[PDB]
Ligand binder design. Structure first.
Ligand code: ZMP
Ligand code: SF4
Ligand code: SF4
Ligand code: FES
Ligand code: ZN
Lengths: 82, 95, 114, 126, 208, 48, 688
């Protein structure tokens, strides 16, 4: 089946996290606007690997990282998942 | 002065009597549950409520260095008797 | 960092002393199981001995290996004498349960053992 | 006399003899014990107690007591620094939870400020 | 201050101070502390390499005879990396004085087995090996004495709790006595008696 | 003890029975303590 | 640069200006003994214990209230310092009665410890010893006023934290009765916190009164429940069981106080507990059985009922571990309709997006605030610890506190603005002499009450107050970074369930009546059997079920908040792990252990056995839920605000009012506090 939930994990000091900060400060509205049926959760604690996860299809947590990636490649991997 | 629960045995001066579904009743088989047959709360109404003409009075316990230590209790509660926490015997005031 | 080890230089002498100690335990077992009038087959006792050896195979620090060799030598002396009785030798074994497995649901019935 | 010594870790848990059930299952906690709030004195501070977590305590079916199958239930180890606490816990093998020390926060109070003129800090009673 | 409080002698204090200063000057290789308490009993605190040289000095030399050997224990002090404290205690037949040779040691590195010069130290060293695990290289026989044979754990440590882990009972199943994990009949309650409020102002350690 | 026998207390037994062990009439132990946590008694009405 | 030289018996140290001798002496370790000074209150001087001979002065002066000139030397161990301590300690024990057996502070006195370590031994004052007869302050606090040493600590606590002003000194000389003059049963919030203030045995706990004396009971770390703030709770446990609790100190949150409900909730905790796995019976009745048949019944029904027809209402006080185990099981079967108890909107990203569903400010950080408004709530009757924090702020520094929605008993002179969402629209427009204070203030803070969020105006009022936050954050140059916005809650497991990304509100089950549901701590009538097909199959798990337990199909005896080493979450994201104190009575197993055993008995499996493995899966759900006692803020306020324009909803004109309005509705409206009888005693003391 299709995608159900998307998990984003970020921090305050990492360049890949800085790119995903620029993604989440510029281009969040198109995802939830186009897809209201995806509660894409965002997480901030202090310092963690900037991870992009997807929970769907009978209990599958699929796992990519957004360590030291540019924001267009981040959106590329996001569309690769979705 | 004891109750008899529907279990059928002697109750005590603490609310600890058994249920019917217990095995401790049947381990009481053959040997009697010995209990003090002279309870505590009933020996409070037997003591007369003394009336002392003073206001802030004393309680020692019947004997110098034999009992509980000194405590001085007040009688400002006009209808309530003063009660020593150690003794358990009451006091009143007579103006 | 200065540390003075017991016997070891590398784990070669460790392997040498532990294989000689196992040879001593092998020729230790049948004399004792005949002397104490025990009740256990020789195969089972030797397999529990080598199982106790294979329990602590995860240690690479050579001082710890030296101290294990010295402890095993101590108990081999105290069992090759008649100083230890039938009770301690059976206490090495576990024939009285102790039945506790490592299943999750078994520990969930008889609970509060995570 | 200037022998082998190698800079490595320690593995005393294969020596101290407590069984592996109690090794890997039970969990330690290192904390400064808090001030018992009814008194106000912090001599009970300045120490790092290592404790173990609590486990089952049923009813003793003849007297009404709390028996337990826990020999380690009444351990405490009062230490002086967090570093030696963590070093000993990692040296003896079992896991551990570190809670951090919390001093009382220094304040700024004065009796003249309790007798203010147009500030609302006013004692209102005495 | 004079009635019911024990008076002292500063003369013995000065004597032990001068003697400890003398020993500290003439064996500089291993002396770290020479401390004297209020009631004049000497303590000498020693690195774990000069065990045999310092004891061969202190048995002899006609200025400190000290033939009499006493206790050995290694007081289990955590919050250290060198945990255990080997405490030699020495008494002089000729001079009537007590010196405490406290050498320090860790968990796994041996001190050098004082039985070579002290024939009283044999079962003392065997006792310390049984109760703690302080290994003694160059020793004739190390065994377990004052414990059970099949028991292990080195119980006088602080890591070993009050009750043992094992507990014997006889059973008619296998017709003998077996050990089980401990099933106490009562708690061994723990009274938090460490009261506050600083009963000794002189022994205050500097806080952070 | 017949020079001064008595004492002025109104609770002393009139027996001082001997050592009554090995009998049908002797001590048994039991915890003189009430209910621990008062287990939940369900509402006994039936639904559906 | 703002230093003062003092010598503590030769040891030099530096002192900030304006402070006391006593804080520097406690800085170097010397605890000068004290009786009237306490750091949560102002400085009286009426106990006289802190005298210390300060040099070149013939008079010996107090240390709790001495300004510190430059270059002191402080002789603590002198002669006449000890002589003054001997004199004062001899004066205290004159008119103090011989009650140390029948006191309740035998292990925890102050006269006893300090008279051992500082006082004389041979007493004097042969005759005399007057006595003051006790009062009746409240049925929750037992009160003997002969032991009162008149130290004026409860009075300062009342007039400076409680704000109630009912305790006072009466009389002169020896005769100073301390209390309320008019036979009034003093009942207010935090009145349970006066038994920890009173240093001598004159104000003790009434329900605890005579069960133990504190050397037997061992003290254990745990985390609070029933409030979203979590004062750090020390349980004094005894006999494989309890005796009592106390509050210990976190520095930032909930400093040295605790809730009255929290203090007196353990009685109902030990009152009516669910003990056994219970199954219905062929008459239609409810009995109990072994775990085998019960979990086999639940497992067979779980195998033969699938789809979206399986629900889980997780309310009350449950774990994060139980929720992760439940989510693992329920995603493992086919799909889910997990829901919480209370309702929280998810349109402007309320489930995710860490900002808009917790208290984003620091609870300690509200003392540095400037102006706070307060949209409908009643914080005296909704987590009173935060109201104590607000009054601490309002008393020490300067606030401007506004309340919108209901005239209630906030005891600290709030400015009320009215009761209308159109007033919030005016602030958004907004013509006030107070909206100017908002958008031209330095540090602005808006506190949302969640009682005004459980109405049918959640998304619109949330979006409007978030637009207020956007407006003032983009204005005023604040700061950066710092925030106007924060919200509150009442139930901790709701906040934890929002942190785990669940679906708040039972509207998904109002849409979908299921074949099967799990009531994990269902308090009252969230749903009925009427709103659902008649073959309901509820599995109600918990402790002392009062409502839901008569709605029973399969009862599981769930554990309690003292019975497991679980992890809870406060309202500002700080994860705090609980610890085991008392094992549950009956069988009454552990929650996630029950879930994994249920998965084992059902024809499936789950990849965890230990609580370390459960912590690993909790880490891979959220990484901040292992960093215990650690806090880190949230951001993305403009993103949440621009996502708060998706469904532009209207706003009502009806007056918004919280349900938590008075004493009885603070006490009764929880499960465990609803259980107890001492709460019923003080409720009928309020009504009588
Ligand atoms: C009645 C029965 C008699 C009593 C039965 C129980 C006897 C208890 C004896 C206890 C003795 C031990 O368990 S010591 C075990 C030593 N284990 C070690 O791993 C030592 C280090 N050595 C090694 O790791 C290696 O030498 C290996 C892997 C064990 C062997 O490698 P090889 O292949 O190169
Ligand atoms: S009641 Fe207690 S706190 Fe209040 S003045 Fe008396 S001794 Fe002090
Ligand atoms: S408060 Fe008074 S009665 Fe109670 S223990 Fe202390 S000195 Fe004794
Ligand atoms: S502490 Fe300074 S007088 Fe009470
Ligand atoms: Zn009396």
């Amino acid at each position: 089946l299709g995608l159900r939930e998307i998990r984003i994990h970020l921090c305050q000091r990492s360049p890949g996290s800085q790119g995903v900060r620029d993604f989440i400060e510029k281009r969040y509205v198109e995802l939830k606007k186009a897809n209201p049926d995806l509660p894409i959760l965002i997480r901030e604690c202090s310092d963690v690997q900037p991870k992009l996860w997807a929970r769907y299809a009978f209990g599958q947590e699929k796992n990519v990282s957004l360590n030291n990636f540019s924001a267009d490649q981040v959106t590329r991997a996001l569309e690769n998942v979705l | 002065g004891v109750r008899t629960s529907p279990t059928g045995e002697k109750v005590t001066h603490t609310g600890q009597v058994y249920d019917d579904e217990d095995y401790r009743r049947v381990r009481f088989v053959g040997r009697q549950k010995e209990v003090n047959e002279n309870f505590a709360i009933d020996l409070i109404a037997e003591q007369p409520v003394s009336q002392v003409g003073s206001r802030v009075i004393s309680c020692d316990g019947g004997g110098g260095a034999l009992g509980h230590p000194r405590v001085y209790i007040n009688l400002d509660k006009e209808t309530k008797t003063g009660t020593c926490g150690y003794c358990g015997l009451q006091f009143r005031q007579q103006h | 960092t200065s540390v003075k080890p017991i016997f070891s230089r590398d784990m070669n002498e460790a392997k040498r002393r532990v294989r000689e100690l196992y040879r001593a335990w092998y020729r230790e077992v049948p004399n004792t199981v005949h002397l104490f009038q025990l009740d256990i087959s020789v195969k089972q006792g030797r397999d529990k001995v080598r199982e106790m050896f294979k329990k602590n195979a995860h240690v690479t620090d050579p001082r710890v290996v030296d101290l294990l060799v010295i402890k095993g030598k101590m108990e081999l002396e105290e069992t090759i004498n008649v100083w230890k009785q039938r009770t301690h030798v059976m206490r090495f074994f576990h024939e009285t349960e102790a039945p506790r497995p490592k299943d999750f649901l078994s520990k969930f019935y008889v609970g509060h053992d995570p | 006399t200037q022998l082998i010594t190698v800079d490595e870790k320690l593995d005393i848990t294969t020596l101290t003899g407590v069984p592996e059930e109690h090794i890997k299952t039970r969990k330690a906690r290192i904390f400064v014990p808090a001030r018992n709030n009814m008194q106000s004195g912090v001599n009970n501070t300045k120490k790092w107690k290592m404790e173990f977590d609590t486990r089952e305590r049923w009813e003793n079916p003849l007297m009404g007591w709390a028996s337990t199958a826990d020999p380690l239930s009444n351990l405490v180890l009062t230490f002086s620094t967090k570093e030696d606490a963590i070093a000993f816990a990692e040296k003896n093998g079992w896991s551990y939870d570190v809670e951090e020390r919390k001093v009382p926060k220094p304040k700024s109070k004065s009796y003249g400020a309790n007798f203010s003129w147009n500030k609302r800090t006013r004692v209102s009673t005495k | 201050t004079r009635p019911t409080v024990r008076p002292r002698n500063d003369v013995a204090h000065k004597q032990l101070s001068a003697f400890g200063e003398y020993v500290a000057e003439i064996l500089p290789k291993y002396v770290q502390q020479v401390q004297v308490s209020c009631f004049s009993e000497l303590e000498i605190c020693i690195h774990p390499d000069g065990v045999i040289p310092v004891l061969t000095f202190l048995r002899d030399h006609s200025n400190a005879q000290f033939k009499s050997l006493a206790d050995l224990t290694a007081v289990d002090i955590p919050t250290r990396q060198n945990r255990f404290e080997i405490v030699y205690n020495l008494l002089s037949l000729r001079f009537n004085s007590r010196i405490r040779v406290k050498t320090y040691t860790d968990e796994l590195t041996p001190v050098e087995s004082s039985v070579s010069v002290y024939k009283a130290a044999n079962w003392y060293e065997r006792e310390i090996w049984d109760m703690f695990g302080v290994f003694f290289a160059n020793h004739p026989d190390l065994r377990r004495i004052l414990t059970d044979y099949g028991f292990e754990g080195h119980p006088f440590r602080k890591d070993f709790p009050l009750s043992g882990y094992v507990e014997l009972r006889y059973d008619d199943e296998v017709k003998r006595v077996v050990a089980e994990p401990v099933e106490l009949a009562q708690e061994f309650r723990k009274f938090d008696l460490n009261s506050p409020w600083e009963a000794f102002p002189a022994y205050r350690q500097p806080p952070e | 003890p017949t020079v001064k026998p008595p004492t002025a207390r109104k609770f002393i037994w009139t027996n001082h029975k001997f050592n009554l062990s090995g009998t049908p009439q002797q001590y048994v132990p039991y915890s003189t303590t009430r209910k621990k946590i008062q287990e939940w008694v369900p509402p006994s009405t039936p639904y559906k | 640069s703002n230093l003062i030289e003092v010598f503590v018996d030769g040891q030099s140290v530096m002192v900030e200006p304006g402070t006391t001798v006593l804080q520097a002496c406690e800085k170097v370790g010397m605890q000068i003994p004290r009786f009237c000074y306490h750091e949560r209150l102002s400085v009286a001087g009426n106990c006289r214990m802190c005298l210390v001979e300060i040099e070149k002065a013939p008079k010996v002066v107090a240390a709790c209230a001495m300004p510190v000139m430059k270059g002191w030397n402080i002789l603590t161990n002198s002669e006449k310092t000890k002589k003054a301590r001997e004199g004062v300690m001899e004066f205290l024990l004159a008119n103090h009665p011989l009650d140390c057996p029948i006191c309740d502070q035998g292990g925890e006195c102050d006269l006893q410890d300090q008279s051992m370590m500082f006082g004389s031994d041979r007493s004097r004052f042969l005759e005399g010893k007057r006595a003051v007869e006790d009062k009746n302050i409240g049925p929750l606090v037992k009160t003997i006023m002969t032991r009162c040493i008149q130290c004026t600590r409860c009075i300062r606590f009342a007039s400076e934290i409680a704000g109630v002003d009912d305790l006072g000194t009466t009389g002169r000389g020896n005769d100073m009765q301390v209390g309320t003059y008019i036979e009034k049963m003093f009942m207010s919030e935090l009145s349970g916190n006066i038994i920890d203030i009173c240093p001598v045995g004159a104000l003790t706990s009434k329900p605890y009164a005579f069960t133990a004396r504190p050397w037997e009971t061992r003290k254990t770390e745990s985390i609070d429940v029933m409030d979203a703030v979590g004062s750090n709770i020390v349980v004094s446990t005894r006999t494989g069981e309890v005796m009592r609790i106390l509050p210990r100190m976190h520095e930032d949150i909930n400093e040295e106080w605790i809730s009255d409900k929290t203090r007196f909730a353990y009685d109902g905790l030990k009152r009516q507990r669910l003990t056994e796995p219970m199954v219905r019976n062929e008459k239609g009745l409810l009995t109990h059985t072994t775990w085998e048949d019960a979990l086999s019944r639940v497992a067979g029904m779980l195998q033969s009922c699938q789809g979206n027809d399986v629900a889980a209402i997780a309310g009350g006080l449950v774990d994060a571990e139980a929720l992760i185990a439940l989510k693992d099981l329920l995603n493992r079967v086919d799909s889910d309709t997990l829901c919480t108890e209370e309702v929280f909107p998810t349109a402007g990203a309320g489930t995710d997006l860490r900002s808009n569903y917790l208290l984003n400010t620091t609870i300690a950080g509200v003392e540095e605030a400037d102006v706070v408004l307060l949209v409908g709530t009643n914080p005296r009757f909704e987590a009173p610890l935060f109201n104590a924090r607000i009054r601490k702020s309002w008393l020490h520094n300067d606030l401007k506190v506004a309340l919108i929605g209901s005239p209630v008993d906030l005891t600290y002179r709030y400015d009320h603005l009215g009761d209308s969402p159109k007033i919030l629209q005016d602030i958004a427009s907004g013509s006030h002499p107070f909206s100017q204070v908002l958008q031209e203030a330095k540090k602005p803070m808006v506190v949302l009450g969640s009682s005004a969020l459980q109405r049918n105006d959640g998304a619109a009022i949330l979006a409007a107050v978030s637009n207020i936050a956007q407006k003032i954050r983009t204005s005023s140059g604040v700061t950066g970074d710092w925030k106007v916005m924060n919200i509150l809650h009442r139930i901790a497991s709701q906040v934890a369930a929002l942190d785990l990304g669940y679906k708040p509100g039972v509207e998904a089950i109002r849409k979908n009546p299921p074949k099967m549901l799990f009531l994990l701590g269902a308090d009252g009538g969230c749903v009925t059997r009427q709103d659902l097909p008649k073959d309901c199959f509820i599995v109600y798990q918990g402790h002392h079920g009062d409502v839901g337990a008569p709605i029973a199909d399969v009862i599981l005896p769930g554990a309690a908040y003292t019975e497991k080493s679980a992890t809870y979450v406060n309202t500002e994201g700080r994860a705090q792990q609980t610890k085991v104190a008392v094992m549950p009575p009956g069988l009454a197993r552990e929650d996630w252990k029950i879930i994994r055993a249920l998965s084992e008995i059902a024809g499936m499996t789950l990849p965890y056995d230990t609580l370390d493995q459960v912590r690993n899966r909790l880490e891979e759900v959220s990484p901040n839920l292992v960093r215990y006692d650690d806090v880190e803020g949230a951001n993305y306020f403009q993103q949440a605000s621009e996502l708060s324009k998706l469904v532009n909803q209207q706003l009502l004109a009806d007056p918004l009012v919280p349900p938590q309005l008075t004493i009885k509705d603070f006490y009764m409206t929880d499960s465990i506090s609803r259980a107890s009888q001492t709460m019923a005693k003080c409720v009928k003391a309020v009504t009588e």
